[PDB]
Amino acid sequence: EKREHEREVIQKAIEENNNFIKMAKEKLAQKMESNKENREAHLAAMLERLQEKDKHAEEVRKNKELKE
Amino acid sequence: REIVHIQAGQCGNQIGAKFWEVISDEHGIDPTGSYHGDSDLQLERINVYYNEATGNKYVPRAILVDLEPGTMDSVRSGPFGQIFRPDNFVFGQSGAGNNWAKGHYTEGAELVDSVLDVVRKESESCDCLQGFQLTHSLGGGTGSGMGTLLISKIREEYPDRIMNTFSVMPSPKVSDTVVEPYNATLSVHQLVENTDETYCIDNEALYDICFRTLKLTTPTYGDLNHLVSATMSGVTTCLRFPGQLNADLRKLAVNMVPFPRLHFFMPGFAPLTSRGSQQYRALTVPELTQQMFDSKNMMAACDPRHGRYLTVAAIFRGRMSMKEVDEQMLNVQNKNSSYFVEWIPNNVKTAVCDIPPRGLKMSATFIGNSTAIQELFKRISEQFTAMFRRKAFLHWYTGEGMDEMEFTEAESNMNDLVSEYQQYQDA
Ligand SMILES: Nc1nc2c(ncn2[C@@H]2O[C@H](COP(=O)(O)OP(=O)(O)O)[C@@H](O)[C@H]2O)c(=O)[nH]1
Ligand SMILES: COc1ccc2c(c1)NC(=O)CN2c1nc(Cl)nc2ccc(F)cc12
Ligand SMILES: [Mg+2]
Numbered sequence: 494e495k496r497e498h499e500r501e502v503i504q505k506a507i508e509e510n511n512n513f514i515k516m517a518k519e520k521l522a523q524k525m526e527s528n529k530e531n532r533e534a535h536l537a538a539m540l541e542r543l544q545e546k547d548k549h550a551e552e553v554r555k556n557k558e559l560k561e
Numbered sequence: 562r563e564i565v566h567i568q569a570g571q572c573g574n575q576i577g578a579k580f581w582e583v584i585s586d587e588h589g590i591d592p593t594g595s596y597h598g599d600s601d602l603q604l605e606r607i608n609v610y611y612n613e614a615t616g617n618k619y620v621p622r623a624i625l626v627d628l629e630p631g632t633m634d635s636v637r638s639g640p641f642g643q644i645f646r647p648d649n650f651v652f653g654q655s656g657a658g659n660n661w662a663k664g665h666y667t668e669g670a671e672l673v674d675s676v677l678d679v680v681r682k683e684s685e686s687c688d689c690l691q692g693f694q695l696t697h698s699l700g701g702g703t704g705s706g707m708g709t710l711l712i713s714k715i716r717e718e719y720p721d722r723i724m725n726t727f728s729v730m731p732s733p734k735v736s737d738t739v740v741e742p743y744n745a746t747l748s749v750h751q752l753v754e755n756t757d758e759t760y761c762i763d764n765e766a767l768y769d770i771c772f773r774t775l776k777l778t779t780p781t782y783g784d785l786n787h788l789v790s791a792t793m794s795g796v797t798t799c800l801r802f803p804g805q806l807n808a809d810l811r812k813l814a815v816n817m818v819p820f821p822r823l824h825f826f827m828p829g830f831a832p833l834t835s836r837g838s839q840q841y842r843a844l845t846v847p848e849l850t851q852q853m854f855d856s857k858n859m860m861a862a863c864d865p866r867h868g869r870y871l872t873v874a875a876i877f878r879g880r881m882s883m884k885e886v887d888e889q890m891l892n893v894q895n896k897n898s899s900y901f902v903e904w905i906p907n908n909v910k911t912a913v914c915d916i917p918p919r920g921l922k923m924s925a926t927f928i929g930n931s932t933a934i935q936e937l938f939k940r941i942s943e944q945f946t947a948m949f950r951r952k953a954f955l956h957w958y959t960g961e962g963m964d965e966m967e968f969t970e971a972e973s974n975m976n977d978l979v980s981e982y983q984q985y986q987d988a
Contacts, residue, residue, distance in 0.1 A: 499710075503666055503667055503670060505962040506667055506962035
């Protein structure tokens with residue numbers, strides 16, 4: 494019985510050293526992925542409105558051509 | 562009847578090494594393994610502790626074990642370091658970091674089989690193997706955690722040989738780290754189950770004896786270990802030398818241990834001496850006898866007047882009258898007969914050996930199975946729960962697999978042990 498216990502304790506220290514490398518590795522990848530989407534989503538929002546600005550400069554120039 | 566010696570970790574190897582120096586000098590064996598002595602009394606029982614090598618050299622039957630290469634290299638560099646059979650240096654490299662769990666479950670597990678292999682080679686050489694004696698401390702990690710793991714495994718391979726330890730108790734007065742009470746409670750649980758005989762070498766008592774009685778203002782481990790080698794030579798006298806007794810570990814265990822778990826002995830020594838300085842008046846047999854029973858000479862910080870002596874062995878070394886020994890020993894009993902149990906008749910036994918230890922002309926070594934040793938196990942139980950009630954420092958151990966439960970069991974077994982010693986103090 495005592496040796497059964499002795500190997501269960503070393504199996505736990507391994508189990509937990511491992512679960513800890515695991516959850517770190519995963520916590521990282523989750524963060525790095527949510528960060529690319531967020532930063533991109535933000536850069537996309539900036540462009541979508543910088544370009545909606547270009548569409549309004551078409552509409553404005555096409556109005557002065559409805560002057561002549 | 563061969564004995565197999567094992568010393569494990571920082572403390573077990575440092576005192577382990579002094580023991581072999583000390584007794585190598587008493588048996589006239591030198592640092593090369595060559596005998597250069599006067600009396601035949603020195604070689605008649607040399608085989609109990611030494612193996613006889615070709616060229617008629619003597620090699621200690623000693624297995625040296627550490628999770629760290631540090632101390633063990635210092636042994637090999639020490640004065641008698643060359644005497645030790647080099648194959649018997651078994652050691653890892655990671656260390657055990659004063660952590661019982663690393664000694665017992667992770668780091669020690671890796672290394673234990675290689676130790677068990679050198680133990681096996683030595684046992685097989687043996688003609689009639691009495692058993693084993695281990696030197697370790699209970700307060701670090703190697704000697705404490707791995708040490709008891711070895712003791713568990715030896716008892717599985719050799720279930721019917723005697724297991725004897727010299728266990729150094731930790732003390733805030735001489736402490737490396739704050740987890741020593743944790744490490745020692747875990748070990749004491751092991752020791753109650755798996756040894757026949759353990760000598761409780763308290764570092765508290767070694768410290769006070771160094772400070773109060775030897776007047777050493779700032780005692781080193783070398784000062785403590787001088788006391789430890791004196792006691793160790795003492796208690797092993799009647800195993801290494803010829804006398805009327807001619808004892809062995811088993812007879813020792815039969816007569817000293819009335820109840821299997823109460824096998825924790827208080828050693829004591831007289832005269833207390835400090836290294837180097839030799840005083841020149843020999844003692845008188847009455848002096849040895851009063852001093853050796855003196856609490857100031859006990860190597861376990863317990864007051865013998867707070868318990869009862871279950872059994873007692875006393876060993877006298879030097880040229881002296883066995884009449885006066887008989888008389889002086891019969892007199893301390895019948896003067897303080899209250900402190901010996903009535904229900905083990907004639908529980909004090911005495912032996913004499915002609916050869917005194919080096920430096921002294923006459924000496925008395927005391928081995929007491931007193932119920933006052935509970936005071937030691939209470940002291941440590943208090944320091945244990947002082948932290949454990951807040952689960953302090955526990956992570957060092959839960960990190961290596963251990964459960965809180967394992968601590969509750971060890972704590973609980975020790976409080977049981979103290980209750981058991983308390984039962985017989987009233988009987
Ligand atoms: N009497 C004595 N005690 C020691 C000595 N070395 C260490 N200790 C005690 O042992 C405890 C430390 O355990 P230690 O054996 O050094 O750790 P280990 O190397 O992992 O076994 C401390 O509480 C010290 O008081 C020594 O040389 N003499
Ligand atoms: C209390 O009753 C006994 C106590 C001890 C013993 C004993 C009976 N009888 C035995 O045969 C072994 N023996 C001893 N063993 C060892 Cl190793 N050292 C000793 C040193 C001094 C001494 F007085 C006895 C022993
Ligand atoms: Mg240390």
